[PDB]
Amino acid sequence: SDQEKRKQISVRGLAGVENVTELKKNFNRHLHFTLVKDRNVATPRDYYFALAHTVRDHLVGRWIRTQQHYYEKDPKRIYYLSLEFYMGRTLQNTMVNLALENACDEATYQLGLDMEELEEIEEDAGLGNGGLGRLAACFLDSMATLGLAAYGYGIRYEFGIFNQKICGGWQMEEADDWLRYGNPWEKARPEFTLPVHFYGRVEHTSQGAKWVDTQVVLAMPYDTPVPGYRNNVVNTMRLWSAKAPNGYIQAVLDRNLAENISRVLYPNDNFFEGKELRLKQEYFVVAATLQDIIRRFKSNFDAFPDKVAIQLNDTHPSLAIPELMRVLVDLERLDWDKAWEVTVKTCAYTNHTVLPEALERWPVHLLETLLPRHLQIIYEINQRFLNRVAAAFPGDVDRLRRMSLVEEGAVKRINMAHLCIAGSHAVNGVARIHSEILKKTIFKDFYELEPHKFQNKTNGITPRRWLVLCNPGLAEIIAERIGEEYISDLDQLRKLLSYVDDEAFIRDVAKVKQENKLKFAAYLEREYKVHINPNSLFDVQVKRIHEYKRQLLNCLHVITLYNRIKKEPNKFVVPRTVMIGGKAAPGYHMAKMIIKLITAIGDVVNHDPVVGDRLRVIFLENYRVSLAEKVIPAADLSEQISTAGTEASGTGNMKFMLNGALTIGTMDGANVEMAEEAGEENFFIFGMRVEDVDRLDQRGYNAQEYYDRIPELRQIIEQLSSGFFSPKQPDLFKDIVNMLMHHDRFKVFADYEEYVKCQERVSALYKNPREWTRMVIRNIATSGKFSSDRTIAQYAREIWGVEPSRQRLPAPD
Amino acid sequence: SDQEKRKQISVRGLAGVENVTELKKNFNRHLHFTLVKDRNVATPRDYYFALAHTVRDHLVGRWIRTQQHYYEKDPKRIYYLSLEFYMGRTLQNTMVNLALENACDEATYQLGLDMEELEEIEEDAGLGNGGLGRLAACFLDSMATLGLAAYGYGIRYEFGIFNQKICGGWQMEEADDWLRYGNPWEKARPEFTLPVHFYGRVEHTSQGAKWVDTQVVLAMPYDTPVPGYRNNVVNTMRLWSAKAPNGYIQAVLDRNLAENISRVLYPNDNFFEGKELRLKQEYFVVAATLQDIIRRFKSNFDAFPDKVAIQLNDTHPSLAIPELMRVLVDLERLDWDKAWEVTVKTCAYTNHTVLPEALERWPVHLLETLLPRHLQIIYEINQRFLNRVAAAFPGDVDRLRRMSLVEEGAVKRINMAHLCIAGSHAVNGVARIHSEILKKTIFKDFYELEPHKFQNKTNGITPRRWLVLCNPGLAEIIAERIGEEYISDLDQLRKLLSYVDDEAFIRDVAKVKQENKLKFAAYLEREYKVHINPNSLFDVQVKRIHEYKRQLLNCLHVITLYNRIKKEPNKFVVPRTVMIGGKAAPGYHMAKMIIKLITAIGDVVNHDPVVGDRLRVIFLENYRVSLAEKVIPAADLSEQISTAGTEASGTGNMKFMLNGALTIGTMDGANVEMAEEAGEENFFIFGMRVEDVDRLDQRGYNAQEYYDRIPELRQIIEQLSSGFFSPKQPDLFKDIVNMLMHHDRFKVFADYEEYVKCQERVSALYKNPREWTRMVIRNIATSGKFSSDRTIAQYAREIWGVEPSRQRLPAPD
Ligand SMILES: *Cc1c(COP(=O)(O)O)cnc(C)c1O
Ligand SMILES: *Cc1c(COP(=O)(O)O)cnc(C)c1O
Ligand SMILES: OC[C@H]1O[C@H](O)[C@H](O)[C@@H](O)[C@@H]1O
Ligand SMILES: OC[C@H]1O[C@H](O)[C@H](O)[C@@H](O)[C@@H]1O
């Protein structure tokens, strides 16, 4: 008896076989017992929640079984540490990966509800800035689909990336209260809360170093399930929330100081701000995470790297290296060398940018008072690492200065990237050209010392959210010719090359794109009361606003199109709707000026009667993952025009390719590989190559030369300076003009002519619908390489030492 | 079709008929799908939660049906506004009121679990200080049991009353993180969030006054169900939580300033601290609550008082009077007189104390900057009210000064009590002697102007939590002679007088008390490693520490008992375990010194070998509702010794009476009525009566007179002064001695002799178990009047204008 009785406590049978009668029963149960509502007062939001809780049950049954499986099998575990996870919406993705969509649609329909209406109630979970955070999300999806025992570890920010409002043509920021109505997917785990220490000092007793007199902040984990595609594997994303440890009133009010650590996501994309609060955030996630990892490993350390892999997403969680050493040496009392060998074999670092202003260099004064023991450990790591450099390159003192983890100057700093290379067994770039640039520029010295460490892992996007979910029309016409295997084996899209001359397929691809454009236009009119002509080429550039991404170059082209129509009003031109969207970091003055310029150009272009519906410029407000899922499937032309050598990889580019848009871009990041897969003849590559940018830097970039030699460019700069785009405040864009003319690090003028000419060729091909569509088919069919399943498979085999698998686990019952 | 399909969405059938097989099924469901756990990792806490969620389902089904019933019947609604609701534990109370206890016990037993272990996992919801907050909780229970459409309205504090730790014999405060693990009973209602305004200014436009330029704080409601006893009626307690309205980082961090309004309960019991944060809390609950009330009434105002009753628990929510006037006049644009007539007919005020330092008088400077429009309205109310006084008492200018809502001085203040009397149709005291003291002392002037307003509503406690729940042994031996009708008709206990000479009943009452003492001793040893001799008289004084409650008088008696044993070591004395417990407000120096004195006396008494087990003094740490439910059923003697005229009513006194303890106390508060019900011959009344205290005040209280005339008292004061109870710090209690000797507002010395003598008589009767028990039966049998069902029935018929009912609603299915 006794404990044997508890055997009845099983997940044995759950909310159903996955069909209509039971879905309806559970939906009714949740509407009343979970939400405490009834049909008389229920709102569409209430019904959305009832459907979400219903679907969550099926997810939870699999989640429990997956974790029970991992405990029994005891596979090597992969921990993906990131300060960002841009997850987006969850309801549809869950229904799709669990094959519940059809039944839920019928169940809601029979109850007198419309599921598509419900689905649109859900808003993004935006705990990320853009590319890096969304890559982490795509990776989570892929690791689950590939059966890896992976855990995503980050911070549960109370407020994710701000909501962007456009007022008077300018960006205004609004806090993203994403949890107001709650989050039905996450599960609070207060019982697993852990302490994280700050400040204090180090004392050296007889048996080692001791970090004492610290202030404590508790880390409370919240777990979110992440489902693999139809394999019944559900992995976990664990995010930490800061809590205060446990006169009088003020002491209780002051608990907010500790809880501020997880209050808001720093809104910087590709830019380092050395704020102490940000440093606390980084150590917070690292300390709680590693405790969790070691605890889980325990329920000696020679086998740790055989059971644990820690992947560092950028240098954000780099403190994991000195923290793991601290724990092993100070707490587990292992000798230094043994601990270091363990640390290096466990950690791997992924770099995401080559721009100096984006890399982390923390002032040592900040590190000595907030984390004294870590700074001590960092200096010791440096000394031993430099000893190795000196032995490998005797007498090369300059190299010692260059490779040091410590940067000298008035403000002493720790170069976190060097710390990561020294403490990781693998370091990777995110696109072939980027990983190569790494090996011969910023990390050349390190590659020369340890060549074996340097790898490449070209980025990817998940075909579930970025094709099956966001573009059902495209997914179905594709499935009708090659089946559904491609969904978890994207290289099968290659089979579509056999239909490049098939009249029905050409017909279908174009009909789908058009249906998408029609629907997107309906979306814009509905929620923003913005009209766009669907029988125009949808020219889209959506990504964070940056000088390096060159939205300004796009701007020059749009003004070029406008001026050309005014010059010859009665000459035909392929009608276009140029859409530019993206958020600017709150303190990035130029990026905000750029947003104002885009809206100001629209104010002129969209209201000039001679232009009419031949050209329209729209700034897409609040670009985020849910908007990307909408606009990308409706795009004809994808703008990927960063200065060659600046965009490490890009991923938006891959989304557009997979969804039927042709690409105009530079030979930068992954564009290079996309062009290689599709064939340059099916791409619109233009401008300076990395070699060309470098030669210009060698001789000196003089924008005045281009200005003096290109009349059409001069006309535009004169209009800007003139106040033609800001009549009421003539000098409004003076900062943009001066930067372009005298301080342009990204050489906009140098690529202007080739850009305008390439755009002419784009228009030329669009004039011929049949050939445009045929080229589109050639892009879609060769986008297979950019599935994040491919990327993750490589990380697993070449870095983590684990074998990917499409073995499915049995359904719960 | 269409909307007709939604008819399937019904509470129709729920988690079961209320029996074992289905309880087990749902418990299993919640353990896995709600908690995301399994039997391998589940902890007792996890299982407690699974049982709580299981029981919650049954509660929710009734909650939905009750609210649907109220909408259809449209009864007059009662709103009980309080800044405190001391709810305590919910699981058992819920099982008892829904008659689910037996089945849940069997269901858990069959699953290999022990329900009593699970139940003890739950901790109190302590959003109250003591008597006033617990009265509100007892009232909620009774209103639901009496079928009234009642709603309790308050604030959802993040931290309730602090947890008291005793360190080195002193009280230390620890924040009560009551929500750490969550609260399964409440339901967040973000969709019903409302705005509350602060600061700003008033401008007088052409059509009225306008409150502009305010700062907004949002009020988000959380609803908790409160079940009536077996009538399937489930009412609501709605508590508001503060949220901020919707460079950049600091602006987001600063949202905490607004959310601080609902962060912590001010820990003052019977004492006014005019802190601005407290004023914000009061207006916060009032503004959100009244909006809610008017909204609910709308889905003209002449009928408002026929549909609405607003009861003000103390002056805490007094701003409801000027706020309702503001809304009616400024927003609904009604004329002043009509609005005032509506306001007075809607509001009623309950006073809870006569001590001057406990009453609210807000500085007008504070009110003019935080709530300018309310201060304007308050001055207008005052002017019109004083005009009425002047007409009723021509030429009595002193009366005008005395009754004014405005108190003059260096610091101008608004007397909130006067505001309440002026704006309410009923004003009540909480015990006969208190309501009479009100009529002839602090509110004499108002009673003379409007005698019809003044009422009495003697307090009560609910027999569900305070008998059936906390003392199952007593409840069953009672049920075996008179059935269970008494549970919701306590006057039936009167039937037990027929068993005062019944040998089996006498036997049973004493066996139950003894079982209770044995179990309480087991509890103390288990969790505090404190031994107490169960074959000793349990002398208990549990309530907040206060000079007016005279724990110090108790202290004098204990030292008297100790000195007497030392004087005649070999003389027999009835063995006693004197227990004193209760929290002191954090800033109340004397109360904290008193706690230290209690522990210091114990340090001497409990370790003196001559005394041994004949006398033991214990300070019960962290007295709270859950401890009261434990210690009260084990008490033999109830200490209710406040100076006559200071304790408005008391309720702990009623708890002890209902649970089998005899009472030693003054003729104060409800003690008077308890003595009247049981007969003074069955009580231990002693000391000065109100008349005696007053005569002493007239001539001047000189404590030295008593000191000079009572040798045993002098001995004690000498020991205190001496350092006999603090050898290492001889003058530690100098402040207590000086206050007693020279500044004792509560005349401890004046009641010492009669107190000691009365205690001798208590011991005399305890020596005779049969007669002690017979007197106990006479107390229990006459405690019926103190059921809060009686109290609420009176509020309903004499103030609210609604008829109580024991009609049961059908079970959900
Ligand atoms: C894919 C994605 C990105 C990354 O876009 P890039 O053009 O590679 O910088 C940024 N934001 C969102 C919302 C995304 O979906
Ligand atoms: C009943 C109760 C009170 C009120 O006690 P009095 O002696 O009337 O002041 C205070 N605290 C708790 C925890 C209670 O249960
Ligand atoms: O690696 C994921 C992404 O990280 C950063 O956002 C880089 O700017 C981008 O090029 C890269 O694609
Ligand atoms: O009215 C409920 C209670 O309120 C206050 O705590 C009074 O001190 C007390 O005497 C009264 O019983």
mmCIF file with all atom_site columns, N, CA and C in Angstrom, chain A residues 207-239:
data_model
loop_
_atom_site.group_PDB
_atom_site.id
_atom_site.type_symbol
_atom_site.label_atom_id
_atom_site.label_alt_id
_atom_site.label_comp_id
_atom_site.label_asym_id
_atom_site.label_entity_id
_atom_site.label_seq_id
_atom_site.pdbx_PDB_ins_code
_atom_site.Cartn_x
_atom_site.Cartn_y
_atom_site.Cartn_z
_atom_site.occupancy
_atom_site.B_iso_or_equiv
_atom_site.pdbx_formal_charge
_atom_site.auth_seq_id
_atom_site.auth_comp_id
_atom_site.auth_asym_id
_atom_site.auth_atom_id
_atom_site.pdbx_PDB_model_num
ATOM 1  N N  . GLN A 1 207 ? 42.502 28.076 3.604   1.00 0.00 ? 207 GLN A N  1
ATOM 2  C CA . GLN A 1 207 ? 42.140 27.110 2.573   1.00 0.00 ? 207 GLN A CA 1
ATOM 3  C C  . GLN A 1 207 ? 41.601 27.660 1.253   1.00 0.00 ? 207 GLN A C  1
ATOM 4  N N  . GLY A 1 208 ? 41.873 28.925 0.953   1.00 0.00 ? 208 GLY A N  1
ATOM 5  C CA . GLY A 1 208 ? 41.409 29.475 -0.302  1.00 0.00 ? 208 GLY A CA 1
ATOM 6  C C  . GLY A 1 208 ? 40.810 30.855 -0.192  1.00 0.00 ? 208 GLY A C  1
ATOM 7  N N  . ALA A 1 209 ? 40.266 31.338 -1.304  1.00 0.00 ? 209 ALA A N  1
ATOM 8  C CA . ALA A 1 209 ? 39.650 32.655 -1.346  1.00 0.00 ? 209 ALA A CA 1
ATOM 9  C C  . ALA A 1 209 ? 38.184 32.557 -0.949  1.00 0.00 ? 209 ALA A C  1
ATOM 10 N N  . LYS A 1 210 ? 37.699 33.579 -0.255  1.00 0.00 ? 210 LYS A N  1
ATOM 11 C CA . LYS A 1 210 ? 36.311 33.605 0.179   1.00 0.00 ? 210 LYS A CA 1
ATOM 12 C C  . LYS A 1 210 ? 35.649 34.947 -0.106  1.00 0.00 ? 210 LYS A C  1
ATOM 13 N N  . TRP A 1 211 ? 34.581 34.891 -0.889  1.00 0.00 ? 211 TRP A N  1
ATOM 14 C CA . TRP A 1 211 ? 33.822 36.075 -1.263  1.00 0.00 ? 211 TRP A CA 1
ATOM 15 C C  . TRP A 1 211 ? 32.841 36.323 -0.117  1.00 0.00 ? 211 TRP A C  1
ATOM 16 N N  . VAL A 1 212 ? 33.070 37.390 0.637   1.00 0.00 ? 212 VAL A N  1
ATOM 17 C CA . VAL A 1 212 ? 32.234 37.682 1.788   1.00 0.00 ? 212 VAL A CA 1
ATOM 18 C C  . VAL A 1 212 ? 31.613 39.058 1.725   1.00 0.00 ? 212 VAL A C  1
ATOM 19 N N  . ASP A 1 213 ? 30.687 39.310 2.650   1.00 0.00 ? 213 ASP A N  1
ATOM 20 C CA . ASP A 1 213 ? 30.023 40.604 2.781   1.00 0.00 ? 213 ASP A CA 1
ATOM 21 C C  . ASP A 1 213 ? 29.250 41.098 1.559   1.00 0.00 ? 213 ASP A C  1
ATOM 22 N N  . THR A 1 214 ? 28.683 40.160 0.815   1.00 0.00 ? 214 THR A N  1
ATOM 23 C CA . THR A 1 214 ? 27.924 40.466 -0.392  1.00 0.00 ? 214 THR A CA 1
ATOM 24 C C  . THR A 1 214 ? 26.478 40.805 -0.091  1.00 0.00 ? 214 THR A C  1
ATOM 25 N N  . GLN A 1 215 ? 25.815 41.375 -1.086  1.00 0.00 ? 215 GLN A N  1
ATOM 26 C CA . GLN A 1 215 ? 24.412 41.693 -0.961  1.00 0.00 ? 215 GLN A CA 1
ATOM 27 C C  . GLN A 1 215 ? 23.798 40.605 -1.821  1.00 0.00 ? 215 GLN A C  1
ATOM 28 N N  . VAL A 1 216 ? 22.653 40.076 -1.409  1.00 0.00 ? 216 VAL A N  1
ATOM 29 C CA . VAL A 1 216 ? 21.994 39.005 -2.153  1.00 0.00 ? 216 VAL A CA 1
ATOM 30 C C  . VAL A 1 216 ? 20.753 39.433 -2.935  1.00 0.00 ? 216 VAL A C  1
ATOM 31 N N  . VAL A 1 217 ? 20.593 38.845 -4.113  1.00 0.00 ? 217 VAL A N  1
ATOM 32 C CA . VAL A 1 217 ? 19.412 39.069 -4.921  1.00 0.00 ? 217 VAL A CA 1
ATOM 33 C C  . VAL A 1 217 ? 19.017 37.659 -5.290  1.00 0.00 ? 217 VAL A C  1
ATOM 34 N N  . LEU A 1 218 ? 17.738 37.346 -5.149  1.00 0.00 ? 218 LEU A N  1
ATOM 35 C CA . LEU A 1 218 ? 17.271 36.008 -5.475  1.00 0.00 ? 218 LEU A CA 1
ATOM 36 C C  . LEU A 1 218 ? 16.853 35.942 -6.933  1.00 0.00 ? 218 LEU A C  1
ATOM 37 N N  . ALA A 1 219 ? 17.072 34.784 -7.538  1.00 0.00 ? 219 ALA A N  1
ATOM 38 C CA . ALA A 1 219 ? 16.729 34.540 -8.925  1.00 0.00 ? 219 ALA A CA 1
ATOM 39 C C  . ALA A 1 219 ? 15.623 33.507 -8.976  1.00 0.00 ? 219 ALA A C  1
ATOM 40 N N  . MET A 1 220 ? 14.415 33.940 -9.321  1.00 0.00 ? 220 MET A N  1
ATOM 41 C CA . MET A 1 220 ? 13.286 33.015 -9.405  1.00 0.00 ? 220 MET A CA 1
ATOM 42 C C  . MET A 1 220 ? 13.029 32.615 -10.862 1.00 0.00 ? 220 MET A C  1
ATOM 43 N N  . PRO A 1 221 ? 13.123 31.319 -11.173 1.00 0.00 ? 221 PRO A N  1
ATOM 44 C CA . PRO A 1 221 ? 12.896 30.865 -12.547 1.00 0.00 ? 221 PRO A CA 1
ATOM 45 C C  . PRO A 1 221 ? 11.436 30.682 -12.984 1.00 0.00 ? 221 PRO A C  1
ATOM 46 N N  . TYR A 1 222 ? 11.186 30.976 -14.258 1.00 0.00 ? 222 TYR A N  1
ATOM 47 C CA . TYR A 1 222 ? 9.880  30.811 -14.885 1.00 0.00 ? 222 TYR A CA 1
ATOM 48 C C  . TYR A 1 222 ? 10.187 29.951 -16.119 1.00 0.00 ? 222 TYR A C  1
ATOM 49 N N  . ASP A 1 223 ? 9.511  28.811 -16.237 1.00 0.00 ? 223 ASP A N  1
ATOM 50 C CA . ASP A 1 223 ? 9.739  27.898 -17.352 1.00 0.00 ? 223 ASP A CA 1
ATOM 51 C C  . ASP A 1 223 ? 8.677  27.995 -18.433 1.00 0.00 ? 223 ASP A C  1
ATOM 52 N N  . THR A 1 224 ? 9.128  28.033 -19.683 1.00 0.00 ? 224 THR A N  1
ATOM 53 C CA . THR A 1 224 ? 8.237  28.086 -20.839 1.00 0.00 ? 224 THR A CA 1
ATOM 54 C C  . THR A 1 224 ? 8.556  26.892 -21.732 1.00 0.00 ? 224 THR A C  1
ATOM 55 N N  . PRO A 1 225 ? 7.520  26.180 -22.182 1.00 0.00 ? 225 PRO A N  1
ATOM 56 C CA . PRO A 1 225 ? 7.733  25.020 -23.057 1.00 0.00 ? 225 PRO A CA 1
ATOM 57 C C  . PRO A 1 225 ? 8.028  25.403 -24.516 1.00 0.00 ? 225 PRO A C  1
ATOM 58 N N  . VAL A 1 226 ? 8.929  24.689 -25.186 1.00 0.00 ? 226 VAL A N  1
ATOM 59 C CA . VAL A 1 226 ? 9.162  24.996 -26.603 1.00 0.00 ? 226 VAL A CA 1
ATOM 60 C C  . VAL A 1 226 ? 9.074  23.645 -27.316 1.00 0.00 ? 226 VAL A C  1
ATOM 61 N N  . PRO A 1 227 ? 8.032  23.464 -28.141 1.00 0.00 ? 227 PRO A N  1
ATOM 62 C CA . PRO A 1 227 ? 7.690  22.275 -28.918 1.00 0.00 ? 227 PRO A CA 1
ATOM 63 C C  . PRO A 1 227 ? 8.444  22.057 -30.229 1.00 0.00 ? 227 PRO A C  1
ATOM 64 N N  . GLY A 1 228 ? 8.866  20.823 -30.446 1.00 0.00 ? 228 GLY A N  1
ATOM 65 C CA . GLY A 1 228 ? 9.540  20.472 -31.684 1.00 0.00 ? 228 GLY A CA 1
ATOM 66 C C  . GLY A 1 228 ? 8.428  20.178 -32.675 1.00 0.00 ? 228 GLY A C  1
ATOM 67 N N  . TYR A 1 229 ? 8.760  20.126 -33.961 1.00 0.00 ? 229 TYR A N  1
ATOM 68 C CA . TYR A 1 229 ? 7.747  19.871 -34.977 1.00 0.00 ? 229 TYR A CA 1
ATOM 69 C C  . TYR A 1 229 ? 7.331  18.414 -35.053 1.00 0.00 ? 229 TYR A C  1
ATOM 70 N N  . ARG A 1 230 ? 6.112  18.139 -34.599 1.00 0.00 ? 230 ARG A N  1
ATOM 71 C CA . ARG A 1 230 ? 5.524  16.803 -34.615 1.00 0.00 ? 230 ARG A CA 1
ATOM 72 C C  . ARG A 1 230 ? 6.363  15.621 -34.106 1.00 0.00 ? 230 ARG A C  1
ATOM 73 N N  . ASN A 1 231 ? 7.250  15.833 -33.138 1.00 0.00 ? 231 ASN A N  1
ATOM 74 C CA . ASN A 1 231 ? 8.050  14.724 -32.616 1.00 0.00 ? 231 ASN A CA 1
ATOM 75 C C  . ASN A 1 231 ? 7.742  14.494 -31.136 1.00 0.00 ? 231 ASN A C  1
ATOM 76 N N  . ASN A 1 232 ? 6.806  15.284 -30.611 1.00 0.00 ? 232 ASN A N  1
ATOM 77 C CA . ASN A 1 232 ? 6.358  15.195 -29.218 1.00 0.00 ? 232 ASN A CA 1
ATOM 78 C C  . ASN A 1 232 ? 7.436  15.542 -28.198 1.00 0.00 ? 232 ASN A C  1
ATOM 79 N N  . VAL A 1 233 ? 8.471  16.228 -28.668 1.00 0.00 ? 233 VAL A N  1
ATOM 80 C CA . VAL A 1 233 ? 9.580  16.658 -27.837 1.00 0.00 ? 233 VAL A CA 1
ATOM 81 C C  . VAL A 1 233 ? 9.264  18.078 -27.402 1.00 0.00 ? 233 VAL A C  1
ATOM 82 N N  . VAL A 1 234 ? 9.266  18.341 -26.102 1.00 0.00 ? 234 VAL A N  1
ATOM 83 C CA . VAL A 1 234 ? 9.032  19.706 -25.636 1.00 0.00 ? 234 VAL A CA 1
ATOM 84 C C  . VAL A 1 234 ? 10.172 20.065 -24.692 1.00 0.00 ? 234 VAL A C  1
ATOM 85 N N  . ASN A 1 235 ? 10.975 21.049 -25.091 1.00 0.00 ? 235 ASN A N  1
ATOM 86 C CA . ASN A 1 235 ? 12.111 21.490 -24.316 1.00 0.00 ? 235 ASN A CA 1
ATOM 87 C C  . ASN A 1 235 ? 11.739 22.683 -23.459 1.00 0.00 ? 235 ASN A C  1
ATOM 88 N N  . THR A 1 236 ? 12.710 23.204 -22.720 1.00 0.00 ? 236 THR A N  1
ATOM 89 C CA . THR A 1 236 ? 12.447 24.331 -21.816 1.00 0.00 ? 236 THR A CA 1
ATOM 90 C C  . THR A 1 236 ? 13.269 25.614 -22.016 1.00 0.00 ? 236 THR A C  1
ATOM 91 N N  . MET A 1 237 ? 12.610 26.751 -21.819 1.00 0.00 ? 237 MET A N  1
ATOM 92 C CA . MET A 1 237 ? 13.294 28.037 -21.852 1.00 0.00 ? 237 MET A CA 1
ATOM 93 C C  . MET A 1 237 ? 13.106 28.517 -20.412 1.00 0.00 ? 237 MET A C  1
ATOM 94 N N  . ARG A 1 238 ? 14.191 28.625 -19.653 1.00 0.00 ? 238 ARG A N  1
ATOM 95 C CA . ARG A 1 238 ? 14.102 29.061 -18.259 1.00 0.00 ? 238 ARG A CA 1
ATOM 96 C C  . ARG A 1 238 ? 14.602 30.483 -18.116 1.00 0.00 ? 238 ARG A C  1
ATOM 97 N N  . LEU A 1 239 ? 13.714 31.383 -17.693 1.00 0.00 ? 239 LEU A N  1
ATOM 98 C CA . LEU A 1 239 ? 14.065 32.795 -17.514 1.00 0.00 ? 239 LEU A CA 1
ATOM 99 C C  . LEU A 1 239 ? 14.010 33.224 -16.041 1.00 0.00 ? 239 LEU A C  1
#
